[PDB]
Amino acid sequence: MPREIITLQLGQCGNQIGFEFWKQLCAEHGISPEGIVEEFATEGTDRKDVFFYQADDEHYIPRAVLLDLEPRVIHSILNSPYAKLYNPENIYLSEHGGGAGNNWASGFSQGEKIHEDIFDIIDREADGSDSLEGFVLCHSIAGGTGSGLGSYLLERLNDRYPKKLVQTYSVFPNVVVQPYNSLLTLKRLTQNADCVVVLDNTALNRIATDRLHIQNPSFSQINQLVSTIMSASTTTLRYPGYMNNDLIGLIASLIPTPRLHFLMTGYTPLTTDQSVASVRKTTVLDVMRRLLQPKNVMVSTGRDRQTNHCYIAILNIIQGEVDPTQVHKSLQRIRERKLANFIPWGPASIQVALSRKSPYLPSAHRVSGLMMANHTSISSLFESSCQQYDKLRKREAFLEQFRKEDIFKENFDELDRSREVVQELIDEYHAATRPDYISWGT
Amino acid sequence: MPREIITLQLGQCGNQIGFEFWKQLCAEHGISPEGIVEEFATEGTDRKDVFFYQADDEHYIPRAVLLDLEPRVIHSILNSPYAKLYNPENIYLSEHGGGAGNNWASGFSQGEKIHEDIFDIIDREADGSDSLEGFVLCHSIAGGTGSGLGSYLLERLNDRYPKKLVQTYSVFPNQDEMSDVVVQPYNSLLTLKRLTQNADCVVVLDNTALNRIATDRLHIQNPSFSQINQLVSTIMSASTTTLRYPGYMNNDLIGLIASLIPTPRLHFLMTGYTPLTTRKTTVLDVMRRLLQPKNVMVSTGRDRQTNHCYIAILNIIQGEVDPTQVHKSLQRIRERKLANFIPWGPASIQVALSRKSPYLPSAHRVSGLMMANHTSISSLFESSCQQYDKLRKREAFLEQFRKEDIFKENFDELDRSREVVQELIDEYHAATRPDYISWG
Amino acid sequence: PQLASSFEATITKFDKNFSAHLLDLLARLSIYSTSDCEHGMASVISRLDFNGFYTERLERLSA
Amino acid sequence: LLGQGDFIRHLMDLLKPELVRPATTLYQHNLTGILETAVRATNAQFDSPEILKRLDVRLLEVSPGDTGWDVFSLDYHVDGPIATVFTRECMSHYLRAFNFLWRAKRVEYILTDI
């Protein structure tokens, strides 16, 4: 039976990242832009039903919903080479072209207004899924749709699929109401998501500039990096392995505490394909060392020198021709060298899984690696978000447009509760970085 | 002995459907429009004696009687390329060229007026039949002739041929379009009454469902009558596949019906066809498409209150079918619970594999039709009853019924028909329920 | 004859006798399935209890 | 050796309402039907048909205090030159491996549901 995962693409950025994700999956599976398996890819051993739906014509259709409140972007997706790849019936676009206005409260009110239309799609995809594992929502916490509508969708998914995993790809901002949107989105990630993978545009831009030599990286290049990351995270889904073949197992390994569900991502190498890295056989140890280098994490978490932040858990998925004995030797050397600081209240989880890449996607590198890490320095991100929220609230900045929205029409208590939840989240992340975390909630 | 079926084409719609039926049978048997067997069709393996008559000139003539109270359709048949296929002596035209005027009461009075001529024709065909199986009346339940004259003919056939089956294909008017006949709900209720009390099987043809199919599956914007009649002819051809391709079991309609209809009153069958469109289809893909609402040929209301279910399903799969794929399809349908069945009985789902006509071009290596008895037909009967109640409570469009003898004094036959149609809707819903055995 | 004697009592009795014989034969079918992976007896079970008219009775007889 | 984890994970997802039953009520035909359904709904349906036709269900010894999870086993029959390749010792090794790895999969499912 398939193990379906529904991809929710929220707002302009979320929809563009979802489109590039589906393009990357198609390229990895040898599926044409219309979803048809390429002749060289007809005999693949991959289970496409997990992330794609299969049409009656052997077309692979993404279980992807592209939602925009403005027609330009939705039409651009339906005008993309993947228009025949995607089910047109899985794209909802609000006829009320007023959008969320980069306002979380407006995005929430829009999610409430389009709840039925969205949940009909979600239920259709769940029934078209033999063993739907969960939904991954790709949205920004700072926008209107990704924050407000994202919070609405997180709530509705938690209510409708209380046994299904909720993963988020939460885009942190680099809009005077951005702190309000961010606080509301952090509240919804904390309360209605099982796991939030933080995608920091500042760190992604830094990587694109320093390693791809892209001056002023465009959103297209950022979304290509995002889709590459999503492909590396889904590689164990797309290629059947012996262990950790489901998102539930991934979440349970990375996110042991449901409220402490902010996940950091890491990728290596983070270099443009034009960076022909000289004739160095990437070893398990060199791979792990590059992934362990803070400059290769695509999320800007503060290196607070006062707080001894630590990794809660790390999974390194190394894709390509990897010797498991070299993986074991690299893990052993990493342990001996204490190259990573782990949570003191739990065992140091540093795993390395060797997997094969999709045969349909060209890999210039015989070995690549993604790290997914739960690391206490994410609390520095939560502290930064709280400081931005407090900076706006203390100035009543950009609250006039929130007061127009129902969540803020009477008061800003939903913003204040989100700020409280995010402060508690930061403090809980710090305790989870501490040996007393086991006693923190006791 | 052959098991002959006489096709009775009533009024404009019935006559047009009969003409397209004869065209389809001719095309399936490789018979020219003049009724002569084409040279290329001499070696067919089909048993024609079941559905066609053989003329003395080696011409295969449909066992079809075209009866109309309005000249347009009968003349269209006699002016068609197939005019020479049919026996002109098998065409009855009411001398009262007034038709039923979309009035059930007028159609009934016309059936009364042509009673003797009709039963004389039926008896002539019965004696010209070695083992006549029965009559199929093609009429509309909403019109005047098909409703009124259809009810009259159903009554007279039931009285004259009490051992012969009388099946009707009753076309219900489009529910989604404003009927030009303000009394159409009355006509429909009267026809449903006659189907319920005096017919063994009423095949409901909903113009609303035909329009829905034309838009959603054939991509026909505003389907023309020609396209609707082409779909009807496709269905009628599919109905004869068990007769036309010799198998080991269930080679006759009588046996099919007896296997499909455990409750004599629950004789309303829904149809589904695939492909409906302007890759080797597997049995499992066929059954999945048939289970797809876009391939069901019956407009049943999705009442959220009544958990409607299938009483019985027959899937006729035409073409090159692997029985191992049929078995896999049955297994997949069972595992997926692709069909909801009546709770008071076992789900009767049969699948017949048949060959296509060698004379008819099939674009699809495999096609499938679903015929389903499904309680959501009650939503149609309830709708018809509600429309009747809406007119009768308002006495709307009653002046023409009061002009007709059946409605001249009162509308009690209409009110009984509305009661019967309400009971039919409620009984179909019960048949969706485990208590169906106690429903009546 | 004897069956003719009762208009509806006979019909009820015949239906009960038929049901008992059907349960017997169905048990024999299941025995043949358990002795021969007999796809035919698996098909008979899946047909006879698809809407659950016989399904519960077949389960009870298995019990 | 459960090399394709997706087929087995989905098969166990579907079987849990079955495999949760006490092992004393498991009969081979139901479990082979479930295996066929899981194969066809999974990528295991694309394994070579010669492999599938010899891919059998083995039921373990039924003892009370057990459920279908503990009594279900897969089996692979052999014939011809293949049987010269796979001797009784190979099959006993495969069986011990199965009985360990199935229990590991059970525990993994247990913790995932936890």
From TrEMBL, chain A:
Tubulin/FtsZ GTPase domain boundaries: 48-241
GO function term, MF aspect, one: microtubule nucleator activity
Protein name (record): Tubulin gamma chain
Subcellular location(s) per record: Cytoplasm, Cytoskeleton, Microtubule organizing center, Centrosome
Superkingdom, natural source: Eukaryota
Stored InterPro entries: Gamma_tubulin, Tub_FtsZ_C, Tubulin, Tubulin/FtsZ-like_C, Tubulin/FtsZ_2-layer-sand-dom, Tubulin/FtsZ_GTPase_sf, Tubulin_C, Tubulin_CS
Function, as annotated: Tubulin is the major constituent of microtubules, protein filaments consisting of alpha- and beta-tubulin heterodimers. Gamma-tubulin is a key component of the gamma-tubulin ring complex (gTuRC) which mediates microtubule nucleation. The gTuRC regulates the minus-end nucleation of alpha-beta tubulin heterodimers that grow into microtubule protafilaments, a critical step in centrosome duplication and spindle formation.
Domain Tubulin/FtsZ 2-layer sandwich, first and last residues per copy: 243-387
Origin species: Sus scrofa (Pig)
Keywords annotated in UniProt: Cytoplasm, Cytoskeleton, GTP-binding, Microtubule, Nucleotide-binding
Family statement: Belongs to the tubulin family.
Keyword set includes Nucleotide-binding: yes
Database matches in SMART domains: Tubulin, Tubulin_C
UniProtKB/TrEMBL annotation, chain C:
Source domain of life: Eukaryota
Subcellular location: Cytoplasm, Cytoskeleton, Microtubule organizing center, Centrosome
Entry function: Component of the gamma-tubulin ring complex (gTuRC) which mediates microtubule nucleation. The gTuRC regulates the minus-end nucleation of alpha-beta tubulin heterodimers that grow into microtubule protafilaments, a critical step in centrosome duplication and spindle formation. Plays a role in neuronal migration.
Protein family: Belongs to the TUBGCP family.
Subunit annotation: Component of the gamma-tubulin ring complex (gTuRC) consisting of TUBGCP2, TUBGCP3, TUBGCP4, TUBGCP5 and TUBGCP6 and gamma-tubulin TUBG1 or TUBG2. TUBGCP2, TUBGCP3, TUBGCP4, TUBGCP5 and TUBGCP6 assemble in a 5:5:2:1:1 stoichiometry; each is associated with a gamma-tubulin, thereby arranging 14 gamma-tubulins in a helical manner. Gamma-tubulin at the first position is blocked by TUBGCP3 at the last position, allowing 13 protafilaments to grow into a microtubule.
This protein's name: Gamma-tubulin complex component
Species: Sus scrofa
From TrEMBL, chain D:
Compartment list: Cytoplasm, Cytoskeleton, Microtubule organizing center, Centrosome
Similarity-based family: Belongs to the TUBGCP family.
UniProt name for this protein: Gamma-tubulin complex component 3
Species the sequence originates in: Sus scrofa
